[PDB]
Design a protein around this nucleic acid. Sequence first.
DNA 1: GTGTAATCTACTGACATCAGAGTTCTTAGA
DNA 2: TCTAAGAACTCTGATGTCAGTAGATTACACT
Lengths: 310, 103, 148, 23, 438, 497
Amino acid sequence: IHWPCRLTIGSNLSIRIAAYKSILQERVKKTWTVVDAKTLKKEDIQKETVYCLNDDDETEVLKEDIIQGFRYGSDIVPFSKVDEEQMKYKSEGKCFSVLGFCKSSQVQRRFFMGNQVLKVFAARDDEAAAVALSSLIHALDDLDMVAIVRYAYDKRANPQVGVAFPHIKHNYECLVYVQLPFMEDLRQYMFSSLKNSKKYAPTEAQLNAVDALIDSMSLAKKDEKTDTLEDLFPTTKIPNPRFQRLFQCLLHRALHPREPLPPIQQHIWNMLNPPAEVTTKSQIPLSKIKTLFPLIEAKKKDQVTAQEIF
Amino acid sequence: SNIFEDVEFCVMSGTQPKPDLENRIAEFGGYIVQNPGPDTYCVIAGSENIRVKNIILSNKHDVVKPAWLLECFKTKSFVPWQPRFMIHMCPSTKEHFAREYDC
Amino acid sequence: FIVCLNKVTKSFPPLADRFMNAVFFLLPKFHGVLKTLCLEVVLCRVEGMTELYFQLKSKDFVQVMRHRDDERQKVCLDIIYKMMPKLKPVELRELLNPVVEFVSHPSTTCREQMYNILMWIHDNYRDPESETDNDSQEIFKLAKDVLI
Amino acid sequence: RCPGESLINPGFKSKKPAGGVDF
Amino acid sequence: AGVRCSLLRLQETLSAADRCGAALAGHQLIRGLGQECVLSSSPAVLALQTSLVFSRDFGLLVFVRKSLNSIEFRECREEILKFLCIFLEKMGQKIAPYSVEIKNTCTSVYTKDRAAKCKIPALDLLIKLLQTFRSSRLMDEFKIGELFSKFYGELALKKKIPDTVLEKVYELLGLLGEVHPSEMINNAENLFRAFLGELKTQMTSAVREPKLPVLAGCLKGLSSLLCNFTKSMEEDPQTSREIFNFVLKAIRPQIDLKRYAVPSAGLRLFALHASQFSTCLLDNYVSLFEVLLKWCAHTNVELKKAALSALESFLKQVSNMVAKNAEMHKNKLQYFMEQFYGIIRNVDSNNKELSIAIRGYGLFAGPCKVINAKDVDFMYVELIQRCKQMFLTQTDTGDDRVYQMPSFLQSVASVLLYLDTVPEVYTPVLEHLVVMQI
Amino acid sequence: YKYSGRDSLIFLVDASKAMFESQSEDELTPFDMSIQCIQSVYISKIISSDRDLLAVVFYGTEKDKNSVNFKNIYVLQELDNPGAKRILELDQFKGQQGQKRFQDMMGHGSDYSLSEVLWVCANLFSDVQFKMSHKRIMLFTNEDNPHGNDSAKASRARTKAGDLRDTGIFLDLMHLKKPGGFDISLFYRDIISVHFEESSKLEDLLRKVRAKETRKRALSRLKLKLNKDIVISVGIYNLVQKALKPPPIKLYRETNEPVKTKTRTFNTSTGGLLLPSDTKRSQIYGSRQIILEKEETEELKRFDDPGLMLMGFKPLVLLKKHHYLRPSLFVYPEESLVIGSSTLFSALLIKCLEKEVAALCRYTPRRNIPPYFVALVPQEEELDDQKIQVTPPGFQLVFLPFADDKRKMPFTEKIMATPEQVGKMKAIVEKLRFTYRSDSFENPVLQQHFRNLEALALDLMEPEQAVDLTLPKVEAMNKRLGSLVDEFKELVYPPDY
DNA sequence: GTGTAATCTACTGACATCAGAGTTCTTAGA
DNA sequence: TCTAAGAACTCTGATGTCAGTAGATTACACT
């Protein structure tokens, strides 16, 4: 959806901006409706969310007698929903405004923390914004500097922070915005560090097996002079197997309206595997892993096979 | 006493013994409530708390001096509200008393 | 730790004198059989310690003495019998009130040990050089009255 | 050992005092 | 008797200030009090202790119902309900005047307490309470139908209920249809729909391995439910097929379990209600007697007893099924008359496997006389000639009587039952073998 | 230590008049300092770790409360999970009137004995049932010679505190600005594990710092199936995970009691309390209705069992940083299964870093979840900060989108700026250069929420209202940058806005 | 049978997470 | 001349997960 806003590097200087979500982890449009087993009508069920006090089933009325609480150590404290709104942190506007800039080094790979990615663009038919924002991002293309920005989609929603990371394509400048953690979203643990290898030995023959694995099972093959490899398995171009599988069932149960469900249609595995020539290359380097490394047991667990035929 | 029955109270603060305030009320049978709904008569507080500020911000309720109820207990008879017995009043009471108090 | 320690010290007391702080520190954390194996290391060494009444009163030992569990109550009364000569009349009065409760106890072996306590109290608190203190005199009356 | 480990909440790494933009 | 000085101190632990530490006294105090009065024997002292335990101003059930809001006293509520489960067994129907207030303690504990380890004994105690007072005048004032509406309602949210508590809700619910059918008279069909719909979902689901305790709880409760409210193929042939093929799913060692509660519950259901499954005995017949006989080999003794008791009811029903049917079943009889005879005539195995096969032959005379009277005498004559040598081990002490000749008597009595004529010349032998049992 | 063990912490203040009512200034007070510390670490521990245990004890007071070894000690609070009513018990003793409130009750300046005080605290920790990971005592006394005038009194303490350390209870100290001097080398030298004004440690107990702190725990464990046969066990750990205001517990108005949301499902026509078996699931398409059971809306969406299947290798440059799915999770070995598989994993880590390579995998965190596709990027540790490990070594799971995720975005074309318009920008950008660090910001809502919650909890006077750090400090942006917004307004666009 | 192991399978606290439902805003709009 | 269809965000509720606790079940074993 369109969202109109104003990119603001300092108190006086604002530029018109209108961002679009670009990656979103996508969910199916129609939910599974709930229906009576014999009538097949979607409104013969009413969902009573009834309440109980535990003093022999005194039933409450939510419109008069139920007040939300939070929890504070060994005890409960009552708020009012109507008084959290009196004290709640309220954003002063539907803001977007830069806090400052710093190197690509300040922002490592791991930490990125978002639900979505924005692409954050000069407003439609603003030719002053077009020159100003093309200047902004062309002045980030060369310094390895990145922006850090307060954001908020709309009023009442939570304020937000993070990295507005530039990139370039021949037809437009990229500057994506992504959320970064606050100090309490970040977890620090000293995982026992592995270069102290004296009890978990990486010996010469083990290393000299792996040395061939990771070249041998390459997907990317150098069949090029662009310095771009064949891209033999373009996973971002594959359609989601979750929705292929859903519509495939809705098809089968539509055309055969009382019959049981089919297996996974085989071409979905043939797509979702990475098989062809790479498996013909792999088998020998894998065969020397089986001996140079140990493979001590793991248990198994069962299914409807725990009481199913033959 | 049989007078404060049918009249519901919130003892939102004390500090005079707060937990004994409602116990004195209990031998007068005044209907004790821990958190004032839109049903209640009035709210009683020995001092301010943030919940009392919430009830200054949300005008809907009648907010009462500590000593007034102790006086009604000492009179052995409910004393109706002289102006200082309140420390804030609701819009229903204020529009009632824009007539019958001076402004 | 306690199961292993019980099996050494049952046969050799001196090593317990290192670990007696650990045994007293862990004593309220166990329940069931381990509680007896823990107290039994006290029994292997109770004639050594000083301050043992405060140390033993620090854990709820008078309540530990009332768990109906025949093994525990026997060794528990056996702690009483070995620390017996070193108490002042003040703590013994406190400690004797729950021992005197056992006169109805069903275990013939447990009741015999309690009579061995009471038989010692009579003999050593009969006619002190001063009759004058209520704590020493109450103990003689109360020990006599249950020996009856 | 001591140098990074908070006295309010042991084993966990010391929470540094919030920062922000400051040139 | 120290029971009252003990109960007096229990009420002090409820009112002590260290509510966390006082529970440890209160628990072990009950753990001592419960020893004193299960130990007792004198009828007068025992009577005192019952009405000290069940006291009205004092005593155990008042301590439960007055401590019921605390979370510290769980350990006391478990132990007091475990103790009452013993005391109600010790005393049997002598508990009558207190029995209603035991019920009210169980349902109050069950609703108000969050912990499954308290909900379990509260359910267990209702199982034994309902089960012992079955015949009683009290059984109306239990409010036995309101109780069904109460514990049936828990299923509308069953997903929340922990696995082992959901055994006992079904052990209970099915038993309400055993003990007082008249108040259940319309509810039984919805409870069938519930027991089946759940057990289908639990057995047949492709996404999750079965919750064995919940599956066993269905089969146990169901075995009580079929005792009244019958479902056998003369009427409701579809639901009675469904019940039967779920019993096959349970009974078949389709892959081996490392705990036997599921087959064990399935076998009891089959043994008591094979009369419900009349036709289906003869559909699946080999796989039935193969699997049932496979369970006679098994090393757990209560599983072996559940196995042995299932075969008898199965063969007895199969014998009726052709006591009044035509020649069609010569194929089935040729399987029985061959196969377990091939066991009796060879096997080195235990007297249990042997004697259940001996039993089998005795039943089939009434089937067999329909096709040929001149096999009936020979299936008697030969059994007598076996008895005339099975007594004749010549004082073989400690081995030969141990299970064996009562099965020859039991089976000769049934080839005898079906003969119309009598070989008078074997009356002396027959009676000598009867004397040899005495 | 192991996962479950609680932190447990007991606070043990000198009630002696010579420190208790004492000041060199007027502006603080050592008892008012210690009590502030105890209230403030305790309000930290309430927000951050309600699971961990606190107690507080006064020694040398004149009226007593103990299990045994009674003389001149008062356990104000035994060991318990922390909450409001305990913070209200400490609040009563604070301040100029507070140092009289305490005197009406427990009484001040009497003789005391550390070997008995250390006995008391020992019994306390013993009396509790929970598993404890760290056992710590905090000394709030200034009395640098703790009246060891009798050396045969003092040797009891030193031996008893040997016994504390021997039983693996720890003990810790703070000195409290004794007039003229304090020196640990006189005494306390052997009780703790050159001369001081007041401890540089003590200000850390006034940080008032708030977050949940949740200890190292797995998300799940999985088998990295290299093919049909070779497997290694790996963990899956959550290095970055957005926190939320804690779930609110619905209450009954008239008593504040908690109440059970007790939902049922009821037939619109009739009394049927419909069981889960009574009802199916469904869709509408093409004006017809499709019907499936409550088993199969979750038999659909199955593909695989819990594991990680290897899909071959890529260049790290082709894993484009513009398309990002959900927060990255760590992968680290686990000998809990597949013993010695750490030997393979470690070689795999080491050699990928030489190849400049990622492994690609298909990932299912559970049964009945579809596979996503994930790049295993390899990782290397910056211990250079005196072994403060800013980065653990292992792999990152970085997730990759599929076609459906990459949403269409409208048409636009331009390449508009001149070298002067970039050239002026290259100045402003270099004037606004700072250093971001990951921990440099805090959530304005979630931090404010706790301050509101405390005001309500203690019945404070005011919400603390501590202003957030996400707003740009615009006057500094006016001044550091300076007037250079006019370079856009003059050189780049017309004066009409 | 009777009694003592060893050990599987449960339940709970706690933490993440998909889904599902409540809520404010754009375009197409009589 | 305006009334729903399509977004968007937060919040609530269930399901599955892990670690740790402890009970009851099931083997093991007696000359």
